[PDB]
């Protein structure tokens, strides 16, 4: 097994303040305003109004 071939793929990610190109399969919801909610915008999560 030490001499057998192995295919390698290295995935390199960038997380900048820029539009998202690749995304997870998480499903979206409607906006809720003026309420204390948990939010998730392009994978950036938080709690607030």
């Amino acid at each position: 097994v030490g001499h057998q071939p192995y295919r390698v793929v290295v995935l390199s990610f960038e997380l900048l303040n820029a539009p998202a190109t690749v995304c997870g399969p998480k499903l979206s919801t409607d906006l809720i305003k003026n309420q204390c909610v948990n939010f998730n915008f392009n994978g950036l999560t938080g709690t607030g109004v």
Partner: protein, 49 residues
């Protein structure tokens, strides 16, 4: 002298606010970033820092 007292208090409060942007050896100064990137165990390491 009265102005000096005012300035000292205002400057101390501003420094307290600015310290939040300061990293302390964690991967990020934003709590939500390490919360959204890392699973709870290593997240607890960074958050404790």
């Amino acid at each position: 002298k009265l102005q000096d007292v005012v300035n000292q208090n205002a400057q101390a409060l501003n420094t307290l606010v600015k310290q939040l942007s300061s990293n302390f050896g964690a991967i990020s100064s934003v709590l939500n970033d390490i919360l959204s990137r890392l699973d709870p165990p290593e997240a607890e390491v960074q958050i404790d820092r």
